[PDB]
Amino acid sequence: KTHVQLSLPVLQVRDVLVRGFGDSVEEVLSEARQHLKDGTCGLVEVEKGVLPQLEQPYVFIKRSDAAPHGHVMVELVAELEGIQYGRSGETLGVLVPHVGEIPVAYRKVLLRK
């Protein structure tokens, strides 16, 4: 399928134990996709002071359309030193590895895979 229904655990930034997916734009997009598929991907909602607490390159989920079965259509965009790889809509948050942190909520998304 070109799209996959996922429910992403929403993590508080100060709980996150693994603060990025890797060391290149290509690796973080690769790892993000692997974690999204394996159900081992969390979401941190972006506010003032969140991003400097996480590791670059960043992976964002961005709204790709204006929401089947409650699932917002999103795609992946990476960012490194203020340059983004991809073009999409509004940020729903930044992806991180999930290694058992307790979430505060779930974000239903339809991921363009």
PDB file of C-alpha atoms in Angstrom:
ATOM      1  CA  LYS A   1       0.000   0.000   0.000  1.00  0.00           C
ATOM      2  CA  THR A   2       1.162   3.594  -0.772  1.00  0.00           C
ATOM      3  CA  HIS A   3      -0.320   4.699   2.618  1.00  0.00           C
ATOM      4  CA  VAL A   4      -0.331   3.024   6.076  1.00  0.00           C
ATOM      5  CA  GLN A   5      -2.610   3.918   9.029  1.00  0.00           C
ATOM      6  CA  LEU A   6      -0.423   4.496  12.116  1.00  0.00           C
ATOM      7  CA  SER A   7      -1.120   5.664  15.700  1.00  0.00           C
ATOM      8  CA  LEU A   8       2.064   7.463  16.900  1.00  0.00           C
ATOM      9  CA  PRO A   9       2.746   7.716  20.671  1.00  0.00           C
ATOM     10  CA  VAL A  10       3.208  11.427  21.530  1.00  0.00           C
ATOM     11  CA  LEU A  11       6.272  11.761  23.884  1.00  0.00           C
ATOM     12  CA  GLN A  12       7.313  14.690  26.145  1.00  0.00           C
ATOM     13  CA  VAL A  13      10.739  15.954  24.842  1.00  0.00           C
ATOM     14  CA  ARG A  14      12.368  15.578  28.344  1.00  0.00           C
ATOM     15  CA  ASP A  15      11.366  11.811  28.442  1.00  0.00           C
ATOM     16  CA  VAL A  16      12.978  10.982  25.072  1.00  0.00           C
ATOM     17  CA  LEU A  17      16.002   8.667  25.551  1.00  0.00           C
ATOM     18  CA  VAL A  18      17.102   8.518  21.859  1.00  0.00           C
ATOM     19  CA  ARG A  19      16.872  12.066  20.505  1.00  0.00           C
ATOM     20  CA  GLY A  20      17.352  11.400  16.752  1.00  0.00           C
ATOM     21  CA  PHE A  21      17.593   8.740  14.031  1.00  0.00           C
ATOM     22  CA  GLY A  22      21.222   9.305  12.928  1.00  0.00           C
ATOM     23  CA  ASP A  23      23.835  11.520  11.382  1.00  0.00           C
ATOM     24  CA  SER A  24      22.807  12.240   7.724  1.00  0.00           C
ATOM     25  CA  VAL A  25      19.539  13.451   6.100  1.00  0.00           C
ATOM     26  CA  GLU A  26      19.447  10.164   4.147  1.00  0.00           C
ATOM     27  CA  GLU A  27      20.010   7.993   7.302  1.00  0.00           C
ATOM     28  CA  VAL A  28      17.385   9.798   9.476  1.00  0.00           C
ATOM     29  CA  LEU A  29      14.715   9.493   6.708  1.00  0.00           C
ATOM     30  CA  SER A  30      15.678   5.772   6.257  1.00  0.00           C
ATOM     31  CA  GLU A  31      15.617   5.038  10.029  1.00  0.00           C
ATOM     32  CA  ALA A  32      12.351   7.045  10.520  1.00  0.00           C
ATOM     33  CA  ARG A  33      10.647   4.938   7.776  1.00  0.00           C
ATOM     34  CA  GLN A  34      12.022   1.693   9.300  1.00  0.00           C
ATOM     35  CA  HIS A  35      10.735   2.700  12.850  1.00  0.00           C
ATOM     36  CA  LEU A  36       7.342   3.847  11.460  1.00  0.00           C
ATOM     37  CA  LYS A  37       6.930   0.404   9.754  1.00  0.00           C
ATOM     38  CA  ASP A  38       8.160  -1.501  12.942  1.00  0.00           C
ATOM     39  CA  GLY A  39       5.855   0.468  15.333  1.00  0.00           C
ATOM     40  CA  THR A  40       8.953   1.856  17.180  1.00  0.00           C
ATOM     41  CA  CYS A  41       8.493   5.574  16.256  1.00  0.00           C
ATOM     42  CA  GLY A  42       7.344   8.375  18.598  1.00  0.00           C
ATOM     43  CA  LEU A  43       6.251  11.962  17.896  1.00  0.00           C
ATOM     44  CA  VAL A  44       7.314  15.087  19.800  1.00  0.00           C
ATOM     45  CA  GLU A  45       5.046  18.132  19.289  1.00  0.00           C
ATOM     46  CA  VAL A  46       7.180  21.151  18.306  1.00  0.00           C
ATOM     47  CA  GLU A  47       7.068  24.229  20.587  1.00  0.00           C
ATOM     48  CA  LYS A  48       9.542  26.916  21.771  1.00  0.00           C
ATOM     49  CA  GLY A  49      12.653  25.110  23.111  1.00  0.00           C
ATOM     50  CA  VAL A  50      11.807  21.573  21.839  1.00  0.00           C
ATOM     51  CA  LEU A  51      14.057  21.326  18.746  1.00  0.00           C
ATOM     52  CA  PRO A  52      17.330  22.451  20.463  1.00  0.00           C
ATOM     53  CA  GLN A  53      16.732  19.532  22.937  1.00  0.00           C
ATOM     54  CA  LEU A  54      16.726  17.011  20.007  1.00  0.00           C
ATOM     55  CA  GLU A  55      19.546  15.908  17.631  1.00  0.00           C
ATOM     56  CA  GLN A  56      19.871  17.050  13.975  1.00  0.00           C
ATOM     57  CA  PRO A  57      19.192  15.995  11.353  1.00  0.00           C
ATOM     58  CA  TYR A  58      15.460  16.255  12.355  1.00  0.00           C
ATOM     59  CA  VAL A  59      12.616  14.270  10.763  1.00  0.00           C
ATOM     60  CA  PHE A  60       9.237  16.075  10.653  1.00  0.00           C
ATOM     61  CA  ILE A  61       5.815  14.692   9.776  1.00  0.00           C
ATOM     62  CA  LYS A  62       3.980  17.358   7.746  1.00  0.00           C
ATOM     63  CA  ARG A  63       0.282  17.407   6.677  1.00  0.00           C
ATOM     64  CA  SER A  64       0.185  16.438   2.937  1.00  0.00           C
ATOM     65  CA  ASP A  65      -3.638  16.959   2.435  1.00  0.00           C
ATOM     66  CA  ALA A  66      -6.794  18.594   4.041  1.00  0.00           C
ATOM     67  CA  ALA A  67      -8.276  12.833   6.955  1.00  0.00           C
ATOM     68  CA  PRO A  68      -9.500   9.251   6.265  1.00  0.00           C
ATOM     69  CA  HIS A  69     -10.913   7.419   9.366  1.00  0.00           C
ATOM     70  CA  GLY A  70      -9.529  10.290  11.596  1.00  0.00           C
ATOM     71  CA  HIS A  71      -5.968   9.708  10.172  1.00  0.00           C
ATOM     72  CA  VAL A  72      -4.248  12.935   8.927  1.00  0.00           C
ATOM     73  CA  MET A  73      -2.271  12.348   5.705  1.00  0.00           C
ATOM     74  CA  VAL A  74       1.402  13.199   6.367  1.00  0.00           C
ATOM     75  CA  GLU A  75       4.794  12.835   4.685  1.00  0.00           C
ATOM     76  CA  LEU A  76       8.439  12.950   5.920  1.00  0.00           C
ATOM     77  CA  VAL A  77      10.686  16.058   5.600  1.00  0.00           C
ATOM     78  CA  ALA A  78      14.244  16.173   7.103  1.00  0.00           C
ATOM     79  CA  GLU A  79      16.110  19.316   8.240  1.00  0.00           C
ATOM     80  CA  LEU A  80      19.887  19.902   8.725  1.00  0.00           C
ATOM     81  CA  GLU A  81      21.419  23.360   9.508  1.00  0.00           C
ATOM     82  CA  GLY A  82      18.165  25.107   8.415  1.00  0.00           C
ATOM     83  CA  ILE A  83      17.812  23.267   5.029  1.00  0.00           C
ATOM     84  CA  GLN A  84      14.769  20.936   4.504  1.00  0.00           C
ATOM     85  CA  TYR A  85      14.695  17.889   2.180  1.00  0.00           C
ATOM     86  CA  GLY A  86      11.129  17.674   1.005  1.00  0.00           C
ATOM     87  CA  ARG A  87       8.306  20.169   0.726  1.00  0.00           C
ATOM     88  CA  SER A  88       4.958  19.632   2.521  1.00  0.00           C
ATOM     89  CA  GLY A  89       2.336  21.319   4.770  1.00  0.00           C
ATOM     90  CA  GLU A  90       2.203  22.150   8.498  1.00  0.00           C
ATOM     91  CA  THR A  91       4.431  20.211  10.989  1.00  0.00           C
ATOM     92  CA  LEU A  92       2.494  17.720  13.197  1.00  0.00           C
ATOM     93  CA  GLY A  93       5.805  17.161  15.081  1.00  0.00           C
ATOM     94  CA  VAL A  94       9.338  15.704  15.040  1.00  0.00           C
ATOM     95  CA  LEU A  95       9.840  11.910  14.922  1.00  0.00           C
ATOM     96  CA  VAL A  96      12.139  10.062  17.360  1.00  0.00           C
ATOM     97  CA  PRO A  97      12.815   6.425  18.209  1.00  0.00           C
ATOM     98  CA  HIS A  98      10.328   5.025  20.770  1.00  0.00           C
ATOM     99  CA  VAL A  99      12.136   2.752  23.308  1.00  0.00           C
ATOM    100  CA  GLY A 100       9.301   2.427  25.926  1.00  0.00           C
ATOM    101  CA  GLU A 101       8.724   6.055  27.079  1.00  0.00           C
ATOM    102  CA  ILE A 102       5.105   6.530  28.396  1.00  0.00           C
ATOM    103  CA  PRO A 103       3.155   8.708  25.908  1.00  0.00           C
ATOM    104  CA  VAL A 104       0.792  11.634  26.764  1.00  0.00           C
ATOM    105  CA  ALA A 105      -1.413  10.998  23.678  1.00  0.00           C
ATOM    106  CA  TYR A 106      -1.629   9.278  20.264  1.00  0.00           C
ATOM    107  CA  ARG A 107      -1.579  11.012  16.847  1.00  0.00           C
ATOM    108  CA  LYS A 108      -3.487   9.040  14.134  1.00  0.00           C
ATOM    109  CA  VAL A 109      -1.724   9.568  10.767  1.00  0.00           C
ATOM    110  CA  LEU A 110      -1.939   8.118   7.236  1.00  0.00           C
ATOM    111  CA  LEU A 111       1.758   7.882   6.169  1.00  0.00           C
ATOM    112  CA  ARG A 112       2.665   8.171   2.451  1.00  0.00           C
ATOM    113  CA  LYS A 113       5.061   5.128   2.332  1.00  0.00           C
TER     114      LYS A 113
END
